[PDB]
Each structure stands twice: as structure tokens, then as C-alpha cells.
Design an enzyme around this catalytic site. Structure first.
Site, PDB file in Angstrom:
ATOM      1  N   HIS A  62     -14.042 -54.818 -38.497  1.00 36.08           N
ATOM      2  CA  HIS A  62     -14.919 -53.586 -37.942  1.00 36.08           C
ATOM      3  C   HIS A  62     -16.260 -54.003 -38.921  1.00 36.08           C
ATOM      4  CE1 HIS A  62     -11.673 -51.761 -36.069  1.00 36.08           C
ATOM      5  NE2 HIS A  62     -10.878 -51.710 -36.944  1.00 36.08           N
ATOM      6  N   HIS A  92     -19.423 -50.998 -47.776  1.00 34.87           N
ATOM      7  CA  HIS A  92     -19.529 -51.567 -46.438  1.00 34.87           C
ATOM      8  C   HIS A  92     -20.995 -51.355 -45.892  1.00 34.87           C
ATOM      9  CE1 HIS A  92     -18.021 -47.851 -45.283  1.00 34.87           C
ATOM     10  NE2 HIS A  92     -18.710 -48.067 -44.207  1.00 34.87           N
ATOM     11  N   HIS A  94     -23.049 -51.182 -41.990  1.00 41.79           N
ATOM     12  CA  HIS A  94     -23.149 -51.138 -40.368  1.00 41.79           C
ATOM     13  C   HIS A  94     -24.534 -51.799 -40.056  1.00 41.79           C
ATOM     14  CE1 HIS A  94     -19.983 -48.168 -40.176  1.00 41.79           C
ATOM     15  NE2 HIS A  94     -20.267 -47.759 -41.293  1.00 41.79           N
ATOM     16  N   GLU A 104     -26.456 -45.859 -39.120  1.00 39.43           N
ATOM     17  CA  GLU A 104     -25.711 -44.877 -38.343  1.00 39.43           C
ATOM     18  C   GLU A 104     -26.572 -43.345 -38.237  1.00 39.43           C
ATOM     19  OE1 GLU A 104     -21.620 -45.252 -39.846  1.00 39.43           O
ATOM     20  OE2 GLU A 104     -21.279 -46.108 -37.859  1.00 39.43           O
ATOM     21  N   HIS A 117     -22.959 -48.090 -46.914  1.00 42.84           N
ATOM     22  CA  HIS A 117     -21.928 -46.965 -47.263  1.00 42.84           C
ATOM     23  C   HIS A 117     -21.370 -47.192 -48.592  1.00 42.84           C
ATOM     24  CE1 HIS A 117     -22.218 -45.118 -42.983  1.00 42.84           C
ATOM     25  NE2 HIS A 117     -23.258 -44.994 -43.636  1.00 42.84           N
ATOM     26  N   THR A 196     -17.572 -41.973 -40.274  1.00 44.72           N
ATOM     27  CA  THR A 196     -18.117 -42.469 -39.040  1.00 44.72           C
ATOM     28  C   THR A 196     -17.163 -43.480 -38.208  1.00 44.72           C
ATOM     29  OG1 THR A 196     -19.232 -44.152 -39.921  1.00 44.72           O
ATOM     30  CG2 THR A 196     -20.353 -42.389 -39.928  1.00 44.72           C
TER      31      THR A 196
HETATM   32 ZN   LIG Z   1     -19.673 -46.626 -43.070  1.00 44.09          ZN
END
Ligand SMILES: [Zn+2]
EC number: 4.2.1.1
Length: 258
Positions: A62, A92, A94, A104, A117, A196
Site C-alpha cells: 500500500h 509512511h 501517500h 490526503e 504520516h 485513512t
Molecule cells: Zn497515512
């Protein structure tokens, strides 16, 4: 199949296995800077990462997670909106397929190239698995990334991505200093939300920093070379692994600054 970011298993589908997807405190959200109110009773954030002990970097299909030793209070977040002590367990990101998307959270509908994050759990619940089931169990420090100059503190991360190209690959990742990922200012917005990603638990106090960090085009390009698939499977580039903004539902976003 299980959850992802594609047309067939992406954020519009998550609610069938994770009905809390349509709940009352989902994340991310759009932060309307005109509607967030300055909250004079919010303390400065205290980020104590001097004894942070990184262990490993992992491609989990992911995103990639950089994991920390969280058996003792070595790297913790406190203050701000928080009571008590929250231990750093992993970070991590996004990110998008293009520089105009990938965060996000959004800020007056503006999307950033990526979002970091830093995930922390409330030590009063003893372990991360118990903490994620509590409404004040988690605190996630979110940092926006814009494309600009290179972030030297990110480059050690960028360099190892070759070794964790596919789902389930990991590499040793010791002695990384997460303080090198922070911007100069710790001014922030805060609101109560959720994870999320599935299982989308409503256990997060979100602390989103006002100041983005800049990374270079070449750095973010390397993130986009990762793969969602496992070794020996057809290549799907790991891009657009973000969930869009969810309804605020009358929650209040508070600012630490005027
Ligand atoms: Zn995250």
C-alpha cells in the site's frame, strides 16, 4: 480481492468490508483555513525524537513503512492537543502520479504532491493493537510535501527504495533520524479523525503541520517507481495511494496559530 487504490478495490469500495468508512469521524478532510479557529488553550507540540530507534523499512503493498522500536519511550509526541505520551511506531507517505495530487488532507482544496504520516500510539493503552481500538489511541503528525528543492533528510529513504520494490520486501533501516523530515515551524491544525486506510478506525487525533516540506522532483520520482504488486506478479506502479477528503460532519478543526 482485498483493499487497494484501484478502480475495483479503491476508496469507493472500502465501505463494504469496513462500514465505518461512512462514519462520523473519517479522515482525511479538507482543512478550510477560513473556518478553522485559533484555539488559545493549545500548547506547543513537543516532538522528542532524540532517541528514535529506526529498525526496518517495509513495502506493504500500500505504501512503505519505516518502523521504529517502540518498546520504550524513545521517540514520542506530546503536548499540542494531546494528553499523555504518544510513542512513534512508524512513518509512511501517500503520493500521486503527478505533482498536483497525492496528499490526503487538502488545504482550502489544495492538494500537495505527497503527505507524510508519523504514526504514534497512546502509551496508557500499553500496546499499539489495544491503542487503535480507543478514541484517543493514536496521534498522527501529518506533513505536506511540495516539489521544490531536495530534502536532504529524505535521501537515505529514497536510496533504499530499490531494495523494497515489491510487496512484502523489507530492508534493514537502522540509525535513521526522523527529525530530518520536519519543517522549521510546528504550527498546526488539529481535529479528531480516523486512520485513512482500512480498517479506518476512528482512533486518531490528527495534527497537520501548516508548513510543507520541499522535496525534489527526482526524490518523488523514486517513490513512483515502487510497486504495489509482489515479486513475479504483473507490475503496477505504486502511485495515487491516497484517500480523498471525507465529510467533516460538524467536527471543528482548531489552529495552533493566528
Ligand atoms: Zn497515512
Amino acid at each position: 480481492h482485498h483493499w487497494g487504490y484501484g478502480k475495483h478495490n479503491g476508496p469507493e469500495h472500502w465501505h463494504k468490508d469496513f462500514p465505518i468508512a461512512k462514519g462520523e469521524r473519517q479522515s482525511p478532510v479538507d482543512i478550510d483555513t477560513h473556518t478553522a479557529k485559533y484555539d488559545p488553550s493549545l500548547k506547543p507540540l513537543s516532538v522528542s525524537y532524540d532517541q528514535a530507534t529506526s529498525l526496518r523499512i517495509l513495502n506493504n503493498g500500500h505504501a512503505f513503512n519505516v518502523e521504529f522500536d517502540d518498546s520504550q519511550d524513545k521517540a514520542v509526541l506530546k503536548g499540542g492537543p494531546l494528553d499523555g505520551t504518544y510513542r512513534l511506531i512508524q512513518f509512511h507517505f501517500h503520493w500521486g502520479s503527478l505533482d498536483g495530487q497525492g496528499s490526503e488532507h487538502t488545504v482550502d482544496k489544495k492538494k500537495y504532491a505527497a503527505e507524510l504520516h508519523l504514526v504514534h500510539w497512546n502509551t496508557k493503552y500499553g500496546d499499539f493493537g489495544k491503542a487503535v481500538q480507543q478514541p484517543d489511541g493514536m496521534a498522527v503528525l501529518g506533513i505536506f510535501l511540495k516539489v521544490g528543492s531536495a530534502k536532504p533528510g529524505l535521501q537515505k529513504v529514497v536510496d533504499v527504495l530499490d531494495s523494497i520494490k515489491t510487496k512484502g520486501k523489507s530492508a534493514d533501516f537502522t540509525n535513521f533520524d526522523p527529525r530530518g523530515l520536519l519543517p522549521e515551524s510546528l504550527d498546526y491544525w488539529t481535529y479528531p479523525g480516523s486512520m485513512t486506510t482500512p480498517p479506518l478506525l476512528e482512533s486518531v487525533t490528527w495534527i497537520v503541520l501548516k508548513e510543507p516540506i520541499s522535496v525534489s522532483s527526482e526524490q518523488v520520482l523514486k517513490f513512483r517507481k515502487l510497486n504495489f504488486n509482489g515479486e513475479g506478479e504483473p507490475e503496477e506502479l505504486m502511485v495515487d495511494n491516497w484517500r480523498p477528503a471525507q465529510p467533516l460532519k460538524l467536527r471543528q478543526i482548531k489552529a495552533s496559530f493566528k
